Amino acid sequence: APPIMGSSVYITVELAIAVLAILGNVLVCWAVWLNSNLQNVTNYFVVSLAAADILVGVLAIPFAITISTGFCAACHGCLFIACFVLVLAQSSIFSLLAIAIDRYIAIAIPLRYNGLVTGTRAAGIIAICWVLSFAIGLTPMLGWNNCGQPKEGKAHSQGCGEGQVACLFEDVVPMNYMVYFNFFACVLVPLLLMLGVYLRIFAAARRQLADLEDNWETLNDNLKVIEKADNAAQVKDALTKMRAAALDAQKKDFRHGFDILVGQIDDALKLANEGKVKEAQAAAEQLKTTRNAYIQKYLERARSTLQKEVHAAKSAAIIAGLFALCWLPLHIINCFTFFCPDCSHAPLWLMYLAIVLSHTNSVVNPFIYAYRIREFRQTFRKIIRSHVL
Ligand SMILES: CC(C)CCC[C@@H](C)[C@H]1CC[C@H]2[C@@H]3CC=C4C[C@@H](O)CC[C@]4(C)[C@H]3CC[C@]12C
Ligand SMILES: CC(C)CCC[C@@H](C)[C@H]1CC[C@H]2[C@@H]3CC=C4C[C@@H](O)CC[C@]4(C)[C@H]3CC[C@]12C
Ligand SMILES: CC(C)CCC[C@@H](C)[C@H]1CC[C@H]2[C@@H]3CC=C4C[C@@H](O)CC[C@]4(C)[C@H]3CC[C@]12C
Ligand SMILES: CCn1c(=O)c2[nH]c(/N=N/c3ccc(OC)c(OC)c3)nc2n(CC)c1=O
Ligand code: NA
Known part of the structure; x- marks a missing residue:
């Protein structure tokens, strides 16, 4: 069937997700800005996390649509539009880990939390984490890429010019980077660390x-x-x-x-x-x-305060688990492509399902806050009532 037909469905779904990711996470940031009851260190990481999801809608999803067409591009420019989403995913991981650690400090040493965890220290950590996310996510632009071995036959068939390639994610981003460096080291290990932190949080609360x-x-x-x-x-x-x-x-x-x-x-x-x-x-x-x-x-x-900390830690853990649920299918597929060269490649429709699923994670956090955190839900209601009604 003509490729533009299946591509139309993929592109329409991506655009729908992008709209929802922007709207929901703008609402998160607006709520924190407006309500001083939401202005705490934990929610500064929530805002950093919402900023990453806003940029998924504004930049990463348009980039994914572009790179699905295989258009002719200079290879290193193609690399940037392939890898920018890795910056946003990495920043999200750092924010999620920080939220877990922040909640552990609050439950384990509540007497020194306010002296240890300050707005100025949070803002510096957030800045540092964004710099590291660019370094990790754009590591292929430092030479760990396939630009030295372009697919010339695919490029020539598309009428690409000299020095240009058909811009396709798996043609420019090395699979060993995606599996060993990005997935195992930069995604799987931090998520497992998060799991360990959450286990200690819930065990400390129970004790x-x-x-x-x-x-x-x-x-x-x-x-x-x-x-x-x-x-x-x-x-x-x-x-x-x-x-x-x-x-x-x-x-x-x-x-x-x-x-x-x-x-x-x-x-x-x-x-x-x-x-x-x-x-x-x-x-x-x-x-x-x-x-x-x-x-x-x-x-x-004391019991009621401790139970609220359990409630806030469960909500934060749901956010971290949903990140894992949405991103693991694409990473697992990459593992099959890499580790099983005797296996047929996952079909294109499943590739696009796994891509759109990873993008839906940028939609879901605003709903978790609305359903699980009354202070957000009440601020959401007032913003909508005044400013959208
Ligand atoms: C502040 C924000 C909105 C700026 C957005 C800049 C984006 C859209 C720019 C910055 C770098 C650009 C890329 C740089 C190089 C090339 C190679 C060329 O052969 C095709 C276009 C391509 C792939 C560009 C696409 C657009 C691009 C990704
Ligand atoms: C995080 C949770 C939802 C787990 C997700 C499991 C998914 C990603 C797994 C389960 C079954 C898997 C498939 C099983 C068999 C094959 C055939 C092979 O030729 C290509 C990979 C492919 C198509 C696998 C891709 C990944 C797959 C779809
Ligand atoms: C905590 C959990 C999510 C850890 C992540 C599990 C990952 C690393 C595991 C789960 C299923 C695994 C795959 C299962 C089957 C095969 C087929 C084999 O020919 C090569 C390895 C490969 C492709 C495995 C690679 C690693 C894999 C994708
Ligand atoms: C998590 C990073 N990541 C990936 O790991 C990733 N892998 C991937 N593979 N896409 C195709 C594979 C084969 C194709 O044709 C044969 C194809 O044709 C259009 C597309 N897209 C990816 N994205 C979305 C930009 C992403 O973001
Ligand atoms: Na995210």
């Missing part, structure tokens, strides 16, 4: 919630021990274990609650050491008033 409940049970258990003690020495032991636990849970109404708690433990401890068991047990019953009015609120707020 911290288990520790919260352990401290709650230990507090209530030791209260029971004091109640059914029969001498002053048993009361002292439990109060001593309670006091060390109270300080462990301590590191304004929160501070007041723990100030009461430790003080009421010291009061009961002093009576215990005078051998006044009954009087000490009565002092320890006061702890329950402090536990109800203060400690349960501290426990519940």
